Design a protein around this nucleic acid. Sequence first.
RNA 1: AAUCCAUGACCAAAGAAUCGUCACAAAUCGAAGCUUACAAAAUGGAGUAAAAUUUUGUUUACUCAGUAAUAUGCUUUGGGUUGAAAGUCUCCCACCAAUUCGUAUGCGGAAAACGUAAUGAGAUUUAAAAAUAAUUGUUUAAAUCAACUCAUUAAGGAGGAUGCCCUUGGGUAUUCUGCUUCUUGACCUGGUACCUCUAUUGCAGGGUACUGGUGUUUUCUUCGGUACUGGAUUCCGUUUGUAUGGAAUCUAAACCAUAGUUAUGACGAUUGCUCUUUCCCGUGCUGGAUCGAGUAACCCAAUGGAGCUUACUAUUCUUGGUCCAUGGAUU
Lengths: 145, 121, 242, 527
Amino acid sequence: VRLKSRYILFEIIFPPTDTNVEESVSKADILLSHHRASPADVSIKSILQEIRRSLSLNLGDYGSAKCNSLLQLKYFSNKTSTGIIRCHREDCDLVIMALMLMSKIGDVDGLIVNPVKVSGTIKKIEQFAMRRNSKILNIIKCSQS
Amino acid sequence: KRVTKHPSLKTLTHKQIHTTIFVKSTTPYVSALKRINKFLDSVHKQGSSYVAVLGMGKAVEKTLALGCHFQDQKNKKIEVYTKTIEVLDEVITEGSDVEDDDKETQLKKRAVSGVELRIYV
Amino acid sequence: MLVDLNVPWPQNSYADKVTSQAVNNLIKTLSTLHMLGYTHIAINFTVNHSEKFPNDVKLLNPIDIKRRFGELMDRTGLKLYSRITLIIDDPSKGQSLSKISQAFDIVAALPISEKGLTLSTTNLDIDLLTFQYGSRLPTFLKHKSICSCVNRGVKLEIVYGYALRDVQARRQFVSNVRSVIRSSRSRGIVIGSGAMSPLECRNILGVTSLIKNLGLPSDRCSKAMGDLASLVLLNGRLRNKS
Amino acid sequence: GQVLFQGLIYSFNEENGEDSTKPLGPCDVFWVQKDTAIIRLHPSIYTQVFNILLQHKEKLTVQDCRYSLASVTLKGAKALESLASCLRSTEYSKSFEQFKMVSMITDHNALPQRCTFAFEAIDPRHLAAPKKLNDSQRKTVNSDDILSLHENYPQDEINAVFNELCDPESRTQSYNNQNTLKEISARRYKLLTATPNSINKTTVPFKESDDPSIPLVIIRRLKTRDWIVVLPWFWLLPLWHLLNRIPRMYHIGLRQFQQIQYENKQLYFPDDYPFTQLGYIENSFYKKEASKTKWDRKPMGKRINFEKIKDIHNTKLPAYSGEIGDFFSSDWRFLQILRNGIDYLQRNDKTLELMDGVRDINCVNDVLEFCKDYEAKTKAMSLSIEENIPVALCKNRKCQFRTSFSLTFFPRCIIAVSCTLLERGHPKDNARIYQVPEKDLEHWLQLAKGVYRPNGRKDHDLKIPLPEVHDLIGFITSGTYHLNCGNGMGIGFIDHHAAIRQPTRYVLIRNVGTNTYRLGEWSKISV
RNA sequence: AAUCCAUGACCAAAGAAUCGUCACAAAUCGAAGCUUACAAAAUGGAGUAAAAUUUUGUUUACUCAGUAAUAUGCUUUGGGUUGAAAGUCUCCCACCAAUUCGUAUGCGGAAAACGUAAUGAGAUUUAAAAAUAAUUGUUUAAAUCAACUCAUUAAGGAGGAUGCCCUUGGGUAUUCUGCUUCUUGACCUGGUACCUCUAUUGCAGGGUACUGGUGUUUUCUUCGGUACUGGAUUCCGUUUGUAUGGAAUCUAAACCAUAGUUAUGACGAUUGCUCUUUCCCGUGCUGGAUCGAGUAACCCAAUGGAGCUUACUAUUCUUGGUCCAUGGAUU
Ligand SMILES: [Mg+2]
């Protein structure tokens, strides 16, 4: 009767996996060392192919066929590592579990995929992204002192 | 002696009322934070510069608390001003079983200290 | 607020001395847990039931959160608690709980055999029951024992970290967690992350979706996880104080 | 001081040496020149008021005003800023000199009680556009002006305007030369060519010969907190047009008037007032028949079943098994008969028993059966032969509160209170008001103090200690979610005996179909 | 022919409710709210305790508003919302003693291509439906009933006659005579009479009172007048006249829903309804208790309200009545 869509916001976080280098313990230092940057070999068709492979490997044949009907990456840029994937409201939990089960990129290792906000509209997703970006600047300004 | 207190004269033109929060003694802290954030966002589309925060009497303490919260939490310039507020009090003067509400009235002025707190963007 | 109760300590025995690299990796993974968003952290330390317990009270816990993590505690703003699991196989080399219950805060068990489950359900002052999710379960999870150990207050702990280690043990972990969900009837289910590396920790949404697709309803996951973790922390703190 | 008030009117009836008084309703009485008294109120009761007044007119003069004098109500902060921009004065006057400054106050509660400004205004169609008044002394407005307003008052001109409005000769002379829209347009077109050829004037000047002088009255009310302006019948339309022409003014209706008056703490004659005759009679009738028609309209399996609701009262009785009162209306007959039976039970013996021409009642089940058979008999003929609930706002002070088998002879007075929900819950109209018991007194106090979960948030998922049945002390008439404080406001009427019984101000609220009991605190309203 | 039982066809009403839960000094699938600033402690508050000071005065250490507020918490509700959100349907959402439907016309109604009431008739042979504005899969009827269309019935008071309960008298229904309900108005042309402006007149234009006439009113669909409805500030004149008027600069908002922009999510628990399965008291009871199933279908807002039509309810929830419909039985 009405096509119900639901977008998922996900972020790529790189943990400082280095035991030979000691790290500073605070809020903004770990926020900066976790939000450093995404590598150059990052694209939309390269992340969609990887998540499709992971979904087909973890769920199966029908589990990937039911979710791959409306599985698209609407907006994503490698500068901040925030992407918005479109999916249905029935298979949203399956897409979240697939994002959780994302092991690694074909060339880049040691990364975590974190789903932050999920909703059925893009306007509220953009509003929450702007709110999160504004909140990020506060700890930065406070720690620069 | 029976005596009632009316509010103080508020003369707001059209927009000084909009970008101004009057902090009561029963006003919660988080609701004040929320309304202050709404005012701060809506000011520059209202066309003002600052957000006035007016409180007198018991609410002065938590008004200063609201001020020093946004002072360092959001790093926004604050300006504190000490003003005097004149309030009219209606008292009964002595001069039949009659209700005390319906009696002769006399007006008296009372001055109280208050704090105005402006917050920049 | 979220609670993690299964952070493992890189040390198995008591003769095993800690390494600075292990402490650095633990600091890294705790920082990553706090980065993904958490409030309560309870590091776990594993020990064998066959090993000799020390004749000490000032040396039962080779952690000493106050001197090691006490700076991280007031800097980043989280808390740490003491938890110890018991790898129990057979009724031998034991019969001591009143001295291990005062030092640590949470006491868990790891039964791997037939009589281990019976002795865990009989007379063990434990809070959580943990199974080897990586390898096969001992015999079969039945209702006769699980119902009886849940009705008293002991919950079942599920490790979603063991799945992210390799590819082959994923099948065994799934076949074991679904058996535990079918036997426990979805009442006393607490979840923890048994990861030692900062690359195997996830957020609340992914874990919730995983446990929902694995057989647990969305009300059970949230309510159980949150309130039961808070309640086990509370009763542990109470039995530690008094 | 000739200030307007809003009190409770009564129907007095004295033939010779006997006086019986019945609750009539509200009224607004105003004095002018100590001899001219105006009384304004609801038409349905206005008919009876006029009748009982004309019954005694041997040394008294009466004058009806139903189609020659009208009034309109303004509410808000900027309500007087548009009334000033609409109204214009014929010539210099002190009433206008004060009204101009009052229009800039912006706060109605700052002004004192006595504030009545009357003068002779120009025709509303005389103005082209609603031009605002001079606004340059807005900053220099201190308390000295309001202090002097109570001293400086032009009684003479205001009294002259009042006498002109009361007298029917000047009121008719006001219609001397009522210009038409075409005539006003022709005047505006001929003023396009005036002798000063330097300034554009879109208005039209006033004339001392060919122009009608229109008298206005402006009064402030303290209870309703509104500004009522009185103007003759045929003159109200031009004023109303220019009033609604202001682009900050909407037309408020009787339902929205109900919302507004329910907002603060106020009450209504037809709907809220449960103790007057006309109000309670038509309330009970119309509401009960309407609800019953809407109920019988729906088929079985489609409406809430008040008769079959389990877990309503602890130690359930086999008398009703569903709702204790009436399924549709908040009935006070059952309340008063039940409380009379309970009082009789406590008067025969210190304790009460629950289970075991008319029988000598020994258990509350017999009282419920009496209520049921009384209602079954009433199902045929008229109801409320004498009364069910009076109001004792002064009698406890007059003599005392004073509390042979009738159970329906003496009524039970009630006080007007307002119950506010202090925790999770939503009230509705026709709600039941129960009294907190004595054994479960600490649980509600702890719930009102605080009971949180180990997570940190509040905890409402617990078992409720369902109370007994003999705890009915009131009924909520106007229950709607209060938007001014963020909670659920309940307008009910509790008994004074039960109010003095409890040592605390805590009280339970329940719906008519819902089986949950919310906790709250009530506050007495002096209305 | 009366009653009962079962099926089928058709008309009308409604769209079960209650409780709890979901991380981040902010969040959620979303939304609103907790702002007429004071505890009469500002007429330069009320007192206690110590030192010194010839009392005042001054320096320290405390009490009083206690029903006290309690830090991103807290309360509410969220797809038929006035039973259809659906539909190329109609209308209101500025006035106009009147070129402005000045419409006292069966009733109600602001209007409605709107509801209903009494009588008569009608079927491409008809006022008009078919086999040479909207909507609907079937799309009024065509033995009788039921349904559609069109043609008449102006409001109130008084008298007489008839019919019913009732037989002083009074009440209701029908029908005939007949009064009261009164804003010098279809539009338009010509003639006469009076007054004002254009600053002497004949004459030129407008208004009013009267008479005469269909007079090419064939543009048979809108063509009349008035109204700056967002906010800020400044200048000037005023008891000689009006008690308020004149004009200037800059910006762009008018943003508003006890759902609000296509969001109304995830499950758990409780009560109620339909039939069937059984038990019990007293045949029976809006009776109680298990063993089960079902809680549907039509479809979904995008500014608000009313009317009409069209989709819905077969083990794919229900309810009430009717039937010159048939089937069985008694009189
Ligand atoms: Mg639509």
